[PDB]
């Protein structure tokens, strides 16, 4: 948790940086699935909250051995043209800590209706009267878009950075680098 690595997307005349962020996020997700562990953080250093923009850099917070095994992992092949990074250097000492969370949404009423077919065996009109079409959630948060090998549907992953606290809390990290209770420094 002491070391951090900054991966900045080198600009591309072919792609706007959102797809580069999505590809890098999927590749680090595959690397974290293959490696294992939950002490690997994810931040966004130039996260502007004005238009919910992700930015153009990405920050990874982890230990020395975990980051060495991450760079030793062959997930980084094919991404050297679009990204550039320094070294896993230590974080500064007086840095406030904030959390990172994946905030999903119930954007499809029909998905929850099909869920309620599998739980109470209700009819279609009972689903429409119980759950209207206005239950869809619009989320104004920065997000990346991804597809999975297990589930072929294309899903959106919203990322939200928490309020800036004064100390860190002992918590794990998900395979996406999002926190199930963990915290990451901010600088």
């Amino acid at each position: 948790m002491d070391h951090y690595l900054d991966i900045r997307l080198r600009p591309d005349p072919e792609f706007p940086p959102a797809q580069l962020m999505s590809v890098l996020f999927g590749k680090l997700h595959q690397a974290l699935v293959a490696q294992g562990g939950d002490r690997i953080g994810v931040s966004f250093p130039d996260l502007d909250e004005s238009r919910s923009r992700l930015g153009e850099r990405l920050r990874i917070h982890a230990s020395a051995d975990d980051l060495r095994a991450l760079l030793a992992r062959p997930w980084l092949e094919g991404l050297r043209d679009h990204l550039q990074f320094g070294e896993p250097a230590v974080v500064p000492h007086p840095t406030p800590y904030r959390q990172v969370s994946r905030v999903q949404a119930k954007s499809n009423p029909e998905r929850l209706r099909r869920r309620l077919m599998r739980r109470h065996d209700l009819s279609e009109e009972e689903a429409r009267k119980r759950i209207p079409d206005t239950v869809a959630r619009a989320l104004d948060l920065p997000f990346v878009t991804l597809r999975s090998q297990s589930t072929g549907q294309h899903f959106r992953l919203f990322i939200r950075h928490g309020p800036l606290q004064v100390t860190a809390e002992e918590g794990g990290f998900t395979c996406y680098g999002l926190s199930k209770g963990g915290f990451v420094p901010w600088f």
Binding site: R10, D12, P13, F15, Q19, V23, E77, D81, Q149, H154
Partner: protein, 298 residues
Amino acid sequence: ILSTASVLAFERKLDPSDALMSAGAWAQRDASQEWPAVTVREKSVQTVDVANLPSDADTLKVRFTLRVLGGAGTPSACNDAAYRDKLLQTVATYVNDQGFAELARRYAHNLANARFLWRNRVGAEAVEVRINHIRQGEVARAWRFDALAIGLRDFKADAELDALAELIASGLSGSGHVLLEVVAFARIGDGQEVFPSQELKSKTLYSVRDAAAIHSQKIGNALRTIDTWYPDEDGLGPIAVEPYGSVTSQGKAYRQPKQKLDFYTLLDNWVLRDEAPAVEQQHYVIANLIRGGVFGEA
């Protein structure tokens, strides 16, 4: 006076065929003959068109043929014969200065790295390019590159590379006919979604005959990405050789006409007022003449 011709149509050199795609397995690419091509499928999400590999495949099989013609300085339709003679003299002077050395090397790079695999290369951990030289229906000389070592930003050298460079340079000079069958091999993953060129069911993906394909002009725009002599800032790599150096991803146009670095001002300096530009600027000018255009006044 020696004014610019009113019509200055230039044909495209390095004609690309319509690039297909197909699916298959790595370490079976030596037997990549009857590989089943991926198909554009309509899926209801509103219905949109999606193209992806099957379950028993992890490698793409994008195949296209490139023909190197020659006569780059010759316009197809020139209004003025004196301007055509002066421009042919200028292009021949460029050929005596360098015999299509750097341009053919950078075009052999854009063949060697799979830049024609636009979005099929970003998520690939292993990219391979095979280039066969078809002459009288037979493979005269084969090549098998690697896009992982040959980066998309730097402009290096390699022995088989230089062999492809002399072949493309001999095609561009006019000393022979070069026809190259280029087959790509990118390990995009098991069943992952690929990116064909998109036709305009809100959005459809372009195909040819029961098999999805990439457009020829996409392969051409990928091959033109040799331009690094623009006033580069913010660490951007090569851009496509276009008039007024424009890119759609950044939404901006390098080689601005308020600077004296766009293609048309460099032409009117080179062939009208005899103000010969730098070696890099004339490299960019001959690359834009290779790609063709509708150049001329009104």
